[PDB]
Amino acid sequence: HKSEVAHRFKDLGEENFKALVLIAFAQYLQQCPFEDHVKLVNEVTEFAKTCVADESAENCDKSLHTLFGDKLCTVATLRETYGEMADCCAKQEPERNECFLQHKDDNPNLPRLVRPEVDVMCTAFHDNEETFLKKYLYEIARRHPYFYAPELLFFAKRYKAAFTECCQAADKAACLLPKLDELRDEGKASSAKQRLKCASLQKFGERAFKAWAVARLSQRFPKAEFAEVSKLVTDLTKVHTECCHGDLLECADDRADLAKYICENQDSISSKLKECCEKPLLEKSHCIAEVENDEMPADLPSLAADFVESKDVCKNYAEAKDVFLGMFLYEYARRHPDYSVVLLLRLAKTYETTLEKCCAAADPHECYAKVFDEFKPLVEEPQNLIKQNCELFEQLGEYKFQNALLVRYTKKVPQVSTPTLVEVSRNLGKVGSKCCKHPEAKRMPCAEDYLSVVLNQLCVLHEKTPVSDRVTKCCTESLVNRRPCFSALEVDETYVPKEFNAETFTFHADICTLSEKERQIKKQTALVELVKHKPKATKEQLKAVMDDFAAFVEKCCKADDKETCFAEEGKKLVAASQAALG
């Protein structure tokens, strides 16, 4: 068209246009005060409305990147506040924009956002609902500049939905709080995953990302043809590269495009794309991405036919190695939506390896005729880990289960920080509840989803504070061996126990009046320390001590003289316990 702005306005809407212009500027000028952004937005919106009225109105013809960068260079305190970034304004568009992207602080040093009192929130929400959400939108945006704007805008409405609902309830806190906790963890998970996807694209490169996307896409669209899957996997990889780089506009258009393509060729991809394709521009992509699996043909032949039997496999393989392998994935993938993408990759890799050590022998056909027999132990390992661990998560609740892990992982890598062992073990226990609720069919893909961000969150810590060579061995290893490495860790025998510190086992009467969250964390922290002190303690010995303790807490936070009970009854526990544990 003649006006890009007028165009975005028209199909975006005044409401969404404004929210996004805000988020956009907030991600670039993360130091400027809110009231300052609110002025630009109006300035820009007054403009956009000018073009919608006359596509020929001065400047309406300029590209968005040009108009955007032009306004940024209007901030007078740019040089003073941002300095080095003000240098970009000297460059001409192609470079200029490239420059700003460079000087975009990923994790700026701003104060952690505190959650005010439900009542103060609801009241703020009442008197001024818009500026209430605009201010927090601005707070999140500047703190997370690489977060996909339209997705940030998606959470925004889910937040406004909870305040609308809960601030009208009699029991506000009881309503609001559990949603703000859910939303929080959800947005945090969505962020880590995106920061995790761009990490992989960088480390392992295109091939590995494509193989991943192939197995993934073909799991969702098992009816689509390998030609379509290829098409998409290719377009998809071009989108992530663009979005990762951080350009909002190019990443937005690219996703819009791929979204329309998938909607138009809908009958050629999935039957479950109905709803998503009827939604508005700003939502199509998000919808499809979160879309559900399609039922698989069931009119499906078999794999052993085209990949283990049919001679000419080496012929078709050597002709185009990766496409053949990609064909193996697409085929094995779409037949197993109950497999984690990494498990599938683990099999394609095995296959690839065999084809290489077989197509180079006298009678190949008899060399690789036992391949599938090798997929067995690779499948059962994670399968068995799921049952085993979900079976235990039932015997004991989420909390009791988290403690089993604590005792378990503390024994693996004792060297690790206690506040970290506790956090990691808590998050793990959570993955156990969020997924073991599911039936066998959806268990593995679930666990992989969560485990992937937890294991990476855990590696980033060791990144800035190494402690164990082992943890570092798996953290650096391939994303396909990243998980099986951790499960292989064995109890540390090299470890020399810690020296007793009564302070570490001295509990005053504060735990009685603490939130469940605090009682547990306090108890769990001591548990980790108990293991670090006596690492050779049986599951039995340990249970006994944990018994005389549970009761202990009771007999003292239910007695007429707390503090005395904790000092007198305490000296008895540590003394008796010290003796039991030898």
Ligand X SMILES: CCCCCCCCCCCCCC(=O)O
User: How many residues interact with ligand X (rule CB under 6 A)?
Assistant: 94
Q: Is 365 annotated as a binding residue?
A: no
Report 364-423 residues binding ligand X (CB under 6 A): 382, 385-386, 389, 409, 412-413, 416
Least CB distance to ligand X at residue 38 (A): 15
- Largest pairwise CA distance in the chain: 88
Residues in 165-194 that interact with ligand X by CB under 6 A: 180, 184
Contact with ligand X (CB under 6 A) among 82, 159, 368, 566:
159
Site for ligand X in 476-515 (CB under 6 A): 478, 480, 483, 486-487, 505
What tokens appear for 184 in the block? 């929080």
Is there binding between residue 72 and ligand X (CB under 6 A)? no
Of 30, 270, 340, 427, which one interacts with ligand X (CB under 6 A)?
A: 340
Shorter beta-carbon distance to ligand X: residue 107 or 366: 107
- Residue of the chain from 145, 150, 222, 337 that contacts ligand X (CB under 6 A): 150
Binding residue for ligand X, selected from 26, 224, 269, 342, defined by CB under 6 A: 342
Q: Are 60 and 5 in contact (CB under 8 A)?
A: yes
Q: 19, 133, 176, 358: which one contacts ligand X (CB under 6 A)?
A: 133
Which parts of 58-148 fold into alpha helices (H)? 64-72, 78-81, 94-102, 118-127, 129-143
DSSP 34: H
CB neighbours of 88 closer than 8 A, spacing ≥ 6? 69, 73, 95, 96, 99, 100, 103
Cβ nearer to ligand X, comparing 362 with 502: 502
Residues numbered 240 to 259 that lie near ligand X (CB under 6 A) are 248-249, 252, 255-256, 258-259
Dihedral pair phi/psi, residue 535, rounded to 5°: -70, -10
Alpha-carbon span 419 to 410, nearest angstrom: 11
Asked whether the beta carbons of 236 and 224 are under 8 A apart, the reply is no
Nearest CA to 62 out of 1, 113, 151 is that of: 1
Between 115 and 473, name the residue whose CB sits nearer to ligand X. Answer: 115
Q: Which of 115, 203, 315, 543 binds ligand X (CB under 6 A)?
A: 115
Minimal distance, residue 394 CB to ligand X, in Å = 12
How many Cβ atoms sit within 10 Å of the Cβ of residue 357? Answer: 11
Interaction between residue 424 and ligand X (CB under 6 A):
yes
Q: Does 216 bind ligand X (CB under 6 A)?
A: yes
Window 271-310: residues binding ligand X (CB under 6 A): 281-282, 284-285, 288-289
CA atoms of 431 and 443, how far apart (whole Å): 10
CA distance 131 to 57: 31
- 245 annotated to bind ligand: yes
Establish if 23 lies at the interface with ligand X (CB under 6 A).
no
Taking the least distance from each CB to ligand X, the nearer of 79 and 115 is 115
Binding to ligand X by residue 20, rule CB under 6 A?
yes
> What tokens were used for 422?
């506790």
Among the listed residues 177, 192, 459, 526, the single contact to ligand X using CB under 6 A: 526
Place of tokens 């003000």: 86
Per CB under 6 A, contacts with ligand X among 439-458 are 444, 447-448, 451, 458
User: Could you tell me which stretch among 206-214, 294-302, 303-311, 362-370 binds ligand X (CB under 6 A)?
Assistant: 206-214
**Residue 564 CB partners (closer than 8 Å, separation 6+):** none
Confirm if 138 and 22 have CB atoms less than 8 A apart.
yes
Could you give the CA distance from residue 414 to residue 201 in angstroms, rounded to a whole number? Answer: 33
Based on the shown chain and the rule CB under 6 A, indicate whether residue 63 belongs to the binding site for ligand X: no
Q: Give Cα separations from 566 to 546, 558, 572 (angstroms).
A: 16, 11, 10
3-class secondary structure, 171: coil
**H or E element that contains 168:** none
Task: List residues forming the annotated binding site.
Answer: 1, 4, 11, 65, 238, 242, 245, 247, 250, 253, 257
Binding-site residue set for Cu cation: 1
From the annotation, which residues make up the binding site for Ca(2+)? 4, 11, 242, 247, 250, 253, 257
